[PDB]
Each structure stands twice: as structure tokens, then as C-alpha cells.
């Protein structure tokens, strides 16, 4: 009998100040009891468990569904925290093409790994005897129980420790490790590859790990985690979109999720009009009608999901390129590729929740997103093709009050182009009329006034109902813009209005602000000056709008 | 050679902090470095029984192509028990010149308390989550930890004792992995003495505090004023009135009377000139009742002025500046705002370390996502400060210009 290499156990403790679980065993049918007796008998014969004496205080409930099911929920609540490296999964677009690839799924994953003996007394459980006229049959685990909190991490660590020397001795092959599966790949010949796979499963057999003996149970195409993996390409598993004349909130969430999942390879996927209906959530039962925008959007999604699209694999010897296009309404779409028309992957970016915004900022955010995603997937930052002129970005970042940066990029011309719509003067304009504006509202009656006086004698005061101070201060500026020439100087005391305009939005949720923007766009030169209120500054009249 | 027991604060579990994505070259650098460190017993591989994690990444210091490993021990530092204290050398900021040395290599000699080692756990990440990350824990004193210098205080004292007894006019301070040495010598003599101290540390960044001071509020001097000029002046004075008590602007605002054009020239009255002069006199004086409170946080605000110029203010209570300044140094940063901001934050933090012996909390004029994406690419400092992000443009920008 060839000795199998010993697998060192991982020391495990319960959470501090806690003790092992004691739970009353559930009553079972005689059939269930017999089934469990047989199963646990063969398991005890296999060494997975062992009978224990009455000394052990701790107990876990067991069920039969025959297949047994030990409910470790309480022990899981009482077991220590573990390090989980399973956050995130490998993305197909990040894989490098290999001439020969093998998939190995280890049978009896958790039952091949020994458990810390000082912890085995906490995994104890009992089998109810017939009619309960005898003491229940007591058992404890000697290996990792499936359903336990610590099983995946320990199994993973053990597997890694076992695989390390083979990997070190084989730089010519690459091994990916995921749960109960190993994915080997090489650019070697098929014979040499199969040979090295035999070597690997032998090396695993030395530690007592079983791999498929036959021709490996899975061959291309591989269906894995919503993906379809083919030898020369990857894609997603076929999309399923339910069609019903009555939609609930949960159905909306599921549809949104599905579309998001499809959007990583299918370019042009949009999800705004459907996500807007997720306001006032937490109620899963409801009937929400769809607008024409949402219906045409979903029809467009059915139009894109009409024919299959494939992504390619990654070649480190070629440059990494990300191109971005504006879709409108705060929506952005991007394609990451190396060869033209052949995408590695695709994606989208929706603007965040804000009162005001402009295209350049959103583009920047998109760039940051794509950058982080790229670093995760390929470990490098891609070169960018952006629908924005170099000179535009120059003016923007040079005059922007915030610090801002984009990595290496070039201008692609694919309209709509991102542009700066208006620019304020840094100095007062000579020969331009000077509009001193002001607005003020009554807090109680919600009645206000907004207007201006100018150096040429031009005046205006407009009365407003249902308004606030800020609204009148904006309204005054808007009035100054409406009734002035192509060039204009504007004086205001509103830190609010100046605060808004100095953020340079090209779009807003306030109609008044949008109109102010539309006015600015029509102007040639605009100088916006600020002064303190109620300082008795001449030309600035609070008394004119306070009547 | 003897480990001193180190615990955490009551009711605080060890740090669990997500490791952020790293580029391939940085990952390889960290692999090489940590392998070499593992062969030297400085760190050891750990198992899944360790839940704790601290972020880690790679940088390149000044005048060096060699990658350096940097651990973000911030969370572990704030979760580490308070170590007690040496009063800050207030004479350090008063010295003519100060040189900063990297005494980090000395920490790897002293072993770390075993029971505490599980809290210094970190992870080298992999690209595309192909393989699980490599997990290490420290065996010796880690660089970047606040406990490491506190433990090495005695050792450092015994080592620097002869040099201290030799030159009583030389101030020596220690912060984290850095050793600040101040004096009044000549740059050549400074460099040679630094070589002497370095060789003294071997067998066992010129910074001039005198060329930096606080800054006053200055007002323009003009022969002729425009309506705009006077409006900006009145604005700045009205602002400064929040700081200086006796500022009045009524005689200047009286000039603006009526609605005139912004470019129209207004001659000043005698009352206005008098008021302006009085305001000048007021501004020439320092600020009333401004003190430093060691029990309070230091706040640093940074404004982007454009053309490579940046202004900053360190304070505790609003309108009570403890320090003001203007970083406009240009090295290789011409096309990159974020690099400029990062170097600015580093310099300000350094100054703060020299003056008060602790780092300030920053308020950065940058979007969170941008900064979080790019700040590690230009960070040469062994420590890290705390920061937040101001999303609303300040009006005071040109008032510090
Ligand atoms: C994540 C991964 C990699 C992999 O394979 C690879 C394993 C190691 C490597 F270095 C490189 C791989 O792939 C590069 C790309 N690729 C892919 C499939 C193919 O047929 N040919 C090919 O070239 C395979 C089979 C996988 C199989 C499953 C399943 N079921 C799930 C995840 C897989």
C-alpha cells in the first residue's frame, strides 16, 4: 500500500465568548431513520465520520431528503470568521488562448480533507432511533462537512498548497483554481498536454485526490457561470427575457439584472427607463406600466439580443484599446478590443445621482471605471479612444477648479462629440452692458420678485408666485441673460447661483437652470461677477426686489 | 531581540480591509520583494484561519528605479492601542535646515509580538482572480505601523546617543519610518554631517524651514480703480472680516453708489483711502488668539489656482489658520493635475509632521473616484494621511491668490 501524503489540518476556533451548538434533534419517519442509518454506516466505513460517546454535549440536527442533510446554521453562526478569496470570479475576456485545455473536477472535495481534531467534537449530531426506545446513534465528523462555514476556505488553501510544487516545476502550463475545479492550459502539443495532465492527476493522487478517470466529463463548449466558453472565443449563455402584460418590481429587478449581464458582450444595451421604475422599492408585489421610451428601449434590447455576439481572448503582445460612445440621457457605452471589430468585451456607464452635471465629467467617470475594470481583468490600463477633441479637454482641465486626469488617449470622431458649451470670461468685458441683478422671496406667502438694473438705465422687476430665494436669484440672472446683447457683464450677490454656474453644467434637473444654460450657449462673452449682499453696494438693489 | 507584548484597543477586532486592484508590474514587484522577505524570515505565509487583511501596493521613491513595498496600515494604526509620550521638538521647525532619512531597514531586526502577528496580515492579489492571493503576515516590526517606532524608541535612543552627545545643537526627531535631522550648518557641511550620521547608522531631500513662514492678506495698490476692482476689493475685505475684527467696508461701498459699468474708473475719496489704509494696518498684524490644540484634528484645505500653482491652509477652528502656504513647484507634473495634487499633499503632510508631529486630515479638490484611481501612482511617502473630498467649488479661491 503506497502511503498517501499527510494533509496538515487548519486550526479552528469558535467566535470568542461562544460555545458549541446544542440543538434539539427533529423527529423523523422510520424510513428516513433507516436511510440515515445506512448512509452514516457507509460513511463511517469510509472514515468520513465516527461514533462518539455520551460525553459530547453538542448536537446538530440532521434531515433526510436518500441523501442526508446536516443543518450547520447554528455552528456557522458560532464558528470564527474565515478569509474568503472567492470575491469576484475570473472573466473570460481576461483569459489567454491556449492550444490545449483540460478541465478537472475533483470528486469528494470536502470529504478528502481532514478536519482539526479539536473541533470535531463541535460537529456532533445524532440519529433518532426507532420509536426512540433506545438512545440515538451519535456521530462526529472527521473531515470537512459540506455546508460548514470553514469548508471552502480550508479546501482551497489545502488544494493550493498541494498544487504549488507541480506549478513551480511546470512553468510551461497554467493552472486556474476555482472551488472544486481545476483548469489547466498549455500551448504544447495535444499529446504532451494530455501527458502532463496525467502527471498532474497523478501528483494529486499522491495526496489522495480523485480526478475523472475517463475522457474528461466536460469538453468544449464549456457552460460555466452564465458563460459559454469556446476554443477560439467566448460569449454569454442565451438570454431569457419573460414577456407579460403585468410587471412586478421583482420582475423588473430580474430583467434589469439579465440585461446588465448581457451588456458585457452585447454593445448598445440600455437600462435607464427600466431602472427608473425601481423608485419606491422594497415592495416586490406591484403593477408598474411602461412608457413609450421604456417599450422602445426594451424592443431595442430585443433587437440587439436578436443575433449572437462573441468576444475574443486576450493577447498580451498586442495593445489594449477602449473606445467610448455617448448614448444620451447620462448613458455611455464602451468597447474593449485589440483588433478592430473584434471585442474583448463591452460595457456601459450610467451617470450618478445629481442635480447638475456635464458630459466631460461623466466621460471622466466612465474612463475611471473602465480603467479599474481593466486593471482587474488584464492588469493594465488600456489606451482610450474618446469622442472629445484634445483642445476641448485641454480647455476643460486647465480651467476646471477641481484636479482631473485621463490616461493616454486619442480623439476618435464618432458623433455626438463631447464639447464645452459655454465659457465665462476671466475679466469684465469692455463695451458690454452691466446688469446688476437681484431676487428675493417671502418665506411665508412664497411670493417673490426678481430683476435687474443696468448702467444704461435699462431696468426690470418681475413678480413671482410660489417661489424661493434661490429661485428668484436664479430667475434674475435668467432675466439678465434674456434681455441682453451677445456680450454682457452680470453682477449678483447669490453665492448659490454663482456656485451652480461655476460647476459648469450642460444639463440640469431644474428647468430654470437649463434655460439659463440655453441662454449662455447663445452668448458670445459672459462675465459673471459676485458681490456681498446688504453691504450697501451701489447698483446692487435689494430694496428694489423687496417691495 | 526580546518581543514586547502588544495588544489592541478594548472592543476592537483586527482590521479587515479590501485589497484594491494592482497592475501587473506592481504585482510582480511585490511577488519578488515578498519572496525575498520570506527567505529572510521577515514575513511568513498564513492560512485561511486568519480573517484579517491590510492593503498593500508598490511604489518608486526619489532617484530610484527599484520598487518599494508599501502597506496601508491606517486602519490597523487606528485600531492599535495608544503607545506612550515624547513631547514634540518645537525647535525642529525653527532650525535653518532639516534632512529626512529613511530608517525603515532597522525595524526588520526587531521581532514582532507573536500573538499580534495575525493582525498584520496582507494579500498580494492576482490578475482576473485566476489564483487566490498570496497571504503573508509579519514576523518582525512592519514599516508603516505606528507601534514600530514606539517600540524602537529605546533602541534608536541608544544608537543616536553618541551623536546627540557630540552635537547638542542638532535636533533629532522621529516619525514613523522617517528620521528628521535639523541644524543651522552649510549645505556642504550639512551633507557631510548627514553622511556621518548615515554611516553611524550603517555600522550599528534638502528641506529649509527658514524659507517657509505664514502668509498675510495683501490688498492691491492702484492709481486708478474700476468698479470691478472695488467690488472684488470689497468682497475680499468682507471675507477677511471673518478673520480680522476691525475691518470695515462702508466707505468703499459708498463709492459703488449707483449703477455703473464694471470697467468704468472711479476716483477714490479721502474717507475711502483712509478706510483702505486702516484695513491694511489691520491686516499687517497677526491673528488674535490663535492656538494649537494637541487634542484636536488638523485640517488641511487645498485650492487649485491653475498653471501649476496650488494654495493651502492648515487650521483647526475655521478662520483660525495655524499655517498657510503656496506650493507651485514644477517637476515633471506639467500635464498632470493629480500628480501635482499628490505631491502637494505629501509636502504639506511633511511640513505638518515637522511642526506638530502629526498628520492633518485633507480636504481635496478632486472627485473621489479620480483620486482613488490614481493617487498611488505618484505617492513616494512611507506614511499616509486621511482625506475627504469637497465637491462644491469654493469662492475663496482667488481670495488666497
Ligand atoms: C477560467 C477557465 C479557464 C479555462 O481554460 C484555461 C486554463 C488555463 C489557462 F492558462 C488558460 C485557459 O483558457 C484560455 C481560453 N480558452 C478557453 C476555453 C478553451 O477551450 N480554450 C481556450 O483557449 C477553462 C477550460 C475553464 C473551464 C470552465 C468550465 N467548465 C470554467 C472556467 C475555465
UniProtKB/Swiss-Prot annotation, chain B:
Mg(2+) 1 binds at residues 102, 177-178. A motif (Tryptophan repeat motif) lies at residues 371-387. Changing residue 181 to A: 37% increase of DNA-directed DNA polymerase activity. No loss of RNA-directed DNA polymerase activity. Changing residue 374 to A: Almost complete loss of RT p66/p51 heterodimerization. Complete loss of polymerase activity. Changing residue 178 to A: Strongly decreased RNA-directed and DNA-directed DNA polymerase activities. Loss of pyrophosphorolysis (reverse of the polymerase reaction). No effect on RNase H activity. Changing residue 149 to G: 34% loss of polymerase activity. No loss of RNase H activity. Changing residue 102 to S: 5- to 12-fold decrease in affinity for dTTP substrates. Strongly decreased RNA-directed DNA polymerase activity. Slightly decreased DNA-directed DNA polymerase activity. No effect on RNase H activity. It comes from Human immunodeficiency virus type 1 group M subtype B (isolate BH10) (HIV-1). Changing residue 205 to A: Complete loss of RNA-dependent DNA polymerase activity. Complete loss of RNA 5'-end and 3'-end cleavages. The record marks 374, 387 as: Essential for RT p66/p51 heterodimerization. Changing residue 159 to V: 70% loss of DNA-directed DNA polymerase activity. 64% loss of RNA-directed DNA polymerase activity. Changing residue 177 to A: Strongly decreased RNA-directed and DNA-directed DNA polymerase activities. No effect on RNase H activity. Changing residue 70 to V: No loss of polymerase activity. No loss of RNase H activity. Changing residue 177 to E: Strongly decreased RNA-directed and DNA-directed DNA polymerase activities. No effect on RNase H activity. Changing residue 383 to L: No effect on RT p66/p51 heterodimerization. Changing residue 159 to T: 34% increase of DNA-directed DNA polymerase activity. 18% increase of RNA-directed DNA polymerase activity. Residues 40-207 form the Reverse transcriptase domain. Changing residue 375 to L: No effect on RT p66/p51 heterodimerization. This is p51 RT.
Amino acid at each position: 500500500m503506497v502511503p498517501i501524503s499527510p494533509i496538515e489540518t487548519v486550526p479552528v476556533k469558535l467566535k470568542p465568548g461562544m460555545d458549541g451548538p446544542k440543538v434539539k434533534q427533529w423527529p423523523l419517519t422510520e424510513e428516513k431513520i433507516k436511510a440515515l442509518v445506512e448512509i452514516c454506516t457507509e460513511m463511517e466505513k469510509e472514515g468520513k465520520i465516527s461514533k462518539i460517546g455520551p460525553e459530547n454535549p453538542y448536537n446538530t440536527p440532521v434531515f433526510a431528503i436518500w441523501r442526508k442533510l446536516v443543518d450547520f446554521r447554528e455552528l456557522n453562526k458560532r464558528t470564527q470568521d474565515f478569509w474568503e478569496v472567492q470575491l469576484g470570479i475570473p472573466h473570460p475576456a481576461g483569459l489567454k488562448k491556449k492550444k490545449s485545455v483540460t478541465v478537472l473536477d475533483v470528486g469528494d472535495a470536502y470529504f478528502s480533507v481532514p478536519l482539526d481534531e479539536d473541533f470535531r467534537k463541535y460537529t456532533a449530531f445524532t440519529i433518532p432511533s426507532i420509536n426512540n426506545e433506545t438512545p440515538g446513534i451519535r456521530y462526529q465528523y472527521n473531515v470537512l462537512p459540506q455546508g460548514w462555514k470553514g469548508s471552502p476556505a480550508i479546501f482551497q488553501s489545502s488544494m493550493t498548497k498541494i498544487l504549488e510544487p507541480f506549478a513551480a516545476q511546470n512553468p510551461d502550463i497554467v493552472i486556474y483554481q476555482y472551488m472544486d475545479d481545476l483548469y489547466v492550459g498549455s500551448d504544447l502539443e495535444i499529446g504532451q498536454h494530455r501527458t502532463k495532465i496525467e502527471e498532474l492527476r497523478q501528483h494529486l493522487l499522491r495526496w489522495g485526490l480523485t480526478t475523472p478517470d475517463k475522457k474528461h466529463q466536460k469538453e468544449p463548449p464549456f457552460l460555466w457561470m452564465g458563460y459559454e466558453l469556446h476554443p477560439d472565443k467566448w460569449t454569454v449563455q442565451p438570454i431569457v427575457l419573460p414577456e407579460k402584460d403585468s410587471w412586478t418590481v421583482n420582475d423588473i429587478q430580474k430583467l434589469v439584472g439579465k440585461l446588465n449581464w448581457a451588456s458585457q458582450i452585447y454593445p448598445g444595451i440600455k437600462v435607464r427607463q427600466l431602472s427608473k421604475l425601481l423608485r419606491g422599492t422594497k415592495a416586490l408585489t406591484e403593477v408598474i406600466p411602461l412608457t413609450e421610451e421604456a417599450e422602445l428601449e426594451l424592443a431595442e434590447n430585443r433587437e440587439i439580443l436578436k443575433e449572437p455576439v462573441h468576444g475574443v481572448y486576450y493577447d498580451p503582445s498586442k495593445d489594449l484599446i477602449a473606445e467610448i460612445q455617448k448614448q444620451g440621457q447620462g448613458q455611455w457605452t464602451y468597447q474593449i478590443y485589440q483588433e478592430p471589430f473584434k471585442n474583448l468585451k463591452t460595457g456601459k456607464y450610467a451617470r450618478m445621482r445629481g442635480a447638475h452635471t456635464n458630459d466631460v465629467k461623466q466621460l471622466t467617470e466612465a474612463v475611471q471605471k473602465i480603467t479599474t475594470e481593466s486593471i482587474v481583468i488584464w492588469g493594465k490600463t488600456p489606451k482610450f479612444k474618446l469622442p472629445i477633441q484634445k483642445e476641448t479637454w485641454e480647455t476643460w482641465w486647465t480651467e476646471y477648479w477641481q484636479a482631473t486626469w485621463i490616461p493616454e488617449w486619442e480623439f476618435v470622431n464618432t458623433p455626438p462629440l463631447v464639447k464645452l458649451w459655454y465659457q465665462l470670461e476671466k475679466e469684465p468685458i469692455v463695451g458690454a452692458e452691466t446688469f446688476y441683478v437681484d431676487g428675493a422671496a417671502n418665506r411665508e406667502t412664497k411670493l417673490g420678485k426678481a430683476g435687474y438694473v443696468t448702467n444704461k438705465g435699462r431696468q426690470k422687476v418681475v413678480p413671482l408666485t410660489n417661489t424661493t430665494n434661490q429661485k428668484t436669484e436664479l430667475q434674475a440672472i435668467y432675466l439678465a441673460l434674456q434681455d441682453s446683447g451677445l456680450e454682457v457683464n452680470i453682477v449678483t450677490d447669490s453665492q448659490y447661483a454663482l456656485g451652480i454656474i461655476q460647476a459648469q453644467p450642460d444639463k440640469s434637473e431644474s428647468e430654470l437652470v437649463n434655460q439659463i444654460i440655453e441662454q449662455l450657449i447663445k452668448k458670445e462673452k459672459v462675465y459673471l461677477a459676485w458681490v456681498p449682499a446688504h453691504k450697501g453696494i451701489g447698483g446692487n438693489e435689494q430694496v428694489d426686489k423687496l417691495v | 531581540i526580546e518581543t514586547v507584548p502588544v495588544k489592541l484597543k478594548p472592543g476592537m477586532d483586527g482590521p479587515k480591509v479590501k485589497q484594491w486592484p494592482l497592475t501587473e508590474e506592481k504585482i510582480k514587484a511585490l511577488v519578488e520583494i515578498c519572496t525575498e522577505m520570506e527567505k529572510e524570515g521577515k514575513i511568513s505565509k498564513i492560512g485561511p484561519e486568519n480573517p484579517y487583511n491590510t492593503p498593500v501596493f508598490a511604489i518608486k521613491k526619489k532617484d530610484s528605479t527599484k520598487w518599494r513595498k508599501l502597506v496601508d496600515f491606517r486602519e490597523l494604526n487606528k485600531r492599535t492601542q495608544d503607545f506612550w509620550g515624547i513631547p514634540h521638538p518645537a525647535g525642529l521647525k525653527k532650525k535653518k535646515s532639516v534632512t529626512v532619512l529613511d530608517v525603515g531597514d532597522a525595524y526588520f531586526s526587531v521581532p514582532l509580538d507573536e500573538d499580534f502577528r495575525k493582525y498584520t496580515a496582507f494579500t498580494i492579489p492576482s490578475i482576473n482572480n485566476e489564483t487566490p492571493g498570496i497571504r503573508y503576515q509579519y514576523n518582525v516590526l512592519p514599516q508603516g505601523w505606528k507601534g514600530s517606532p514606539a517600540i524602537f524608541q529605546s533602541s534608536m535612543t541608544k544608537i543616536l546617543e553618541p551623536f546627540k552627545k557630540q552635537n547638542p545643537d542638532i535636533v533629532i526627531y522621529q516619525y514613523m519610518d522617517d528620521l528628521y535631522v535639523g541644524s543651522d550648518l552649510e549645505i556642504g557641511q550639512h551633507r557631510t554631517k548627514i553622511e556621518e550620521l548615515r554611516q553611524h547608522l550603517l555600522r550599528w531631500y534638502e528641506l529649509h524651514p527658514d524659507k517657509w513662514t505664514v502668509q498675510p492678506i495683501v490688498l492691491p495698490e492702484k492709481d486708478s480703480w474700476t468698479v470691478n476692482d472695488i467690488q472684488k476689493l470689497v468682497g475680499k475685505l468682507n471675507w477677511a472680516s471673518q478673520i480680522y475684527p476691525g475691518i470695515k467696508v462702508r466707505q468703499l461701498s459708498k463709492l459703488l453708489r449707483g449703477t455703473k459699468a464694471l470697467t468704468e474708473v472711479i476716483p477714490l475719496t479721502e474717507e475711502a483711502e483712509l478706510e483702505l489704509a486702516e484695513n491694511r494696518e489691520i491686516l499687517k498684524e497677526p491673528v488674535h488668539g490663535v492656538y494649537y490644540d494637541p487634542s484636536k484634528d488638523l485640517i488641511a484645505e487645498i485650492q487649485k489656482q491653475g498653471q501649476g500653482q496650488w494654495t493651502y491652509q492648515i487650521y483647526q477652528e475655521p478662520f483660525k489658520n495655524l499655517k498657510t502656504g503656496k506650493y507651485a513647484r514644477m517637476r515633471g507634473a506639467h500635464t498632470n493635475d493629480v500628480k501635482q495634487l499628490t505631491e502637494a499633499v505629501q509636502k504639506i503632510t511633511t511640513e505638518s509632521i515637522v511642526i506638530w508631529g502629526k498628520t492633518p486630515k485633507f480636504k481635496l479638490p478632486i472627485q473621489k473616484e479620480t483620486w482613488e484611481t490614481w493617487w498611488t501612482e505618484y505617492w513616494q511617502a512611507t506614511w499616509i494621511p486621511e482625506w475627504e473630498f469637497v465637491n462644491t467649488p469654493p469662492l475663496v479661491k482667488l481670495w488666497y491668490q
